[PDB]
């Protein structure tokens, strides 16, 4: 069924599972054609898939020629995004591959079905939370890895740096989605936050600073606040 | 002309002969339906008076054998059964012609609703659906489920109507996934057509009977299997016009012929609406479409 909040736990339970966003597949920059029409140019995506017990991250590089001479862009990102996870479940061991795989879009569920179809052990579910992953393009070194890329290619990651080190997959899984929650309201001011005290610094190995427990709280005190203030300057309150 | 005796009617029943319905009361005489125009196949129904929980009824052909009807005060229902002694079936039927303790079949010279509604519905077929084969003529009834039903407890009760599932390998070729999901032609063409049932009346014969059993006996597995062999035409790009054409009259006469208070059950809003506006062969339906607007534009 649906994950909702009511079932919010089992994420963090030791069956294997996988979110899909499918959000930063398909990316385009309208423009205007000499003649004023309008066209869109196509830019290099990513698949977002993420084990939210182990913070791994399979970001799958969508390449602009993926796209080339073919119609219906946007009906044909889904069939993409549901090919390339299929592939993934399929390369990996058995004992590896995820019981569940949890869509963040319910226009996905057929697609990945269908490409499933020789899993039929793996459920394939919705979620009824508005999880703010299409903001995975605002961390600098995910943008960064997908625009250059030339081919496509596989990058593996993991979103939670060192984190689960110290705290919880519940907790490391809450700080996640306040930072992107929070990149998604207002990447400047979110940005700000991370970076005010030069002296913290990304680890190369790292997506995220190297924060203490202590400046954790205080950060995400900020990314709370932001997420609140935003609310009321759309909806002045 | 052939005829259905019947021993006597002892309990009060509406009794149905394809599109038709009429009344008997407990112990009226009444010793059947002469006059069954030779030719296709029939299907006589009951519903008993005191329990409108179960339709039941028999499929039949004359052609086949001599039939009658005798009510089972054990079973509680009209069981139909065969007289393999011709001559004296043969004998019978005339007291029962004399005597004027028949109803007359109507043969009306100006339709053809039960010709066109069996058109590619044949005897030997229907048995391999309902299985049964000690006797000539199939039983089906309200509470019988599909082989597909019993999947998701009595198998030899089943309508083993063909399988059909869009999200199968059956139906989806390994690497066409987004194809042959959006386009069915492969699975209706290679698998179904040339593969299962080998001729589109062989389709269309299974069609027509899961269209009739859901209208005649409310059977809920038959009229998805119906809504499922309409959507799978519609569904796919490629049909051979002459099956285009063909379905366009089917359907027609279906939706004729339906009850109008009975719209909400068995039909599907989502199969049609796709059906009739938004798949390939929106434009192949020019008189399903059309009757289906002037009687119910509710459910569009
Ligand atoms: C005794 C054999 N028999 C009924 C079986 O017990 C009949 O002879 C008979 C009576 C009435 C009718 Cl409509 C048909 C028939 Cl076949
Ligand atoms: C259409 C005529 N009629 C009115 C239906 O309500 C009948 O009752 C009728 C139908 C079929 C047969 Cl075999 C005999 C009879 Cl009496």
Redesign the interface.
């Given at each position: 069924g649906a994950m909702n909040s009511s079932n919010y736990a089992e994420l963090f339970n030791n069956d294997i599972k996988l979110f899909v966003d499918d959000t930063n597949v398909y990316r385009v920059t309208v423009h205007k054609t000499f003649e004023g029409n309008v066209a869109t140019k196509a830019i290099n995506g990513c698949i977002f898939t993420l084990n939210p017990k182990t913070g791994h991250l399979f970001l799958k590089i969508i390449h602009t020629s993926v796209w080339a001479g073919q119609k219906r862009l946007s009906q044909?990102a889904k069939?993409k995004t549901?090919?390339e996870v299929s592939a993934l479940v399929r390369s990996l061991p058995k004992e590896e591959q995820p019981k569940q795989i949890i869509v963040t879009r319910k226009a996905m569920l057929?697609?990945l079905?269908?490409?499933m179809?020789?899993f039929p052990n793996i459920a394939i579910r919705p979620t009824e939370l508005r999880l703010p992953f299409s903001a995975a393009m605002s961390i600098d070194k995910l943008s960064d890895v997908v625009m250059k890329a030339t081919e496509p290619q596989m990058v593996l990651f993991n979103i939670y740096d060192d984190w689960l080190d110290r705290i919880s997959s519940y907790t490391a899984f809450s700080r996640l989605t306040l930072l992107l929650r929070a990149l998604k309201t207002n990447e400047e001011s979110a940005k700000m936050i991370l970076l005010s005290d030069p002296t913290i610094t990304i680890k190369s190995y790292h997506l995220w600073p190297s924060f203490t427990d202590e400046q954790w709280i205080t950060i995400e005190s900020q990314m709370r606040d932001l997420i609140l203030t935003e609310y009321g300057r759309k909806y002045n309150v | 002309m052939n005829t259905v005796p019947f021993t006597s009617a002892p309990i009060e029943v509406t009794i149905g002969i394809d599109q038709y319905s009429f009344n008997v009361k407990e112990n009226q005489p009444f010793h059947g339906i002469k006059d069954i125009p030779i030719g296709h196949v029939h299907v006589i129904h009951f519903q008993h008076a005191d329990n409108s929980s179960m339709r039941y009824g028999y499929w039949f052909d004359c052609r086949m054998g001599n039939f009658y009807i005798q009510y089972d005060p054990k079973d509680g229902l009209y069981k139909m059964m065969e007289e393999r002694d011709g001559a004296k079936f043969e004998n019978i039927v005339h007291n029962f012609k004399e005597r004027q303790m028949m109803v007359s079949y109507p043969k009306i010279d100006e339709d053809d609703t039960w010709y066109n509604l069996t058109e590619f519905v044949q005897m030997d077929k229907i048995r391999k659906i309902v299985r049964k084969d000690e006797n000539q003529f199939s039983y089906v009834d309200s509470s019988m489920t599909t082989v597909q039903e019993n999947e998701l407890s009595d198998p030899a009760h089943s309508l083993n109507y063909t399988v059909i599932n869009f999200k199968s390998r059956e139906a989806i070729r390994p690497g066409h996934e987004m194809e042959d999901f959006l386009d069915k032609s492969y699975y209706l063409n290679t698998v179904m057509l040339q593969g299962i049932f080998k001729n589109s009346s062989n389709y269309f014969g299974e069609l027509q009977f899961a269209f009739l059993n859901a209208m005649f006996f409310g059977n809920y597995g038959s009229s998805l299997q119906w809504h499922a062999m309409i959507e799978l035409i519609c569904s796919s790009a490629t049909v051979p016009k002459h099956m285009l054409d063909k379905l366009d009259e089917i359907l027609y006469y279906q939706i004729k012929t339906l009850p109008e208070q009975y719209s909400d059950i068995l039909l599907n809003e989502r199969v049609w609406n796709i059906c009739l506006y938004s798949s390939f062969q929106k434009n192949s339906l020019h008189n399903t479409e059309k009757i289906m607007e002037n009687k119910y534009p509710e459910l569009l």
């Open positions: 044909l069939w549901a090919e057929d697609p079905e269908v490409h179809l020789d | -």
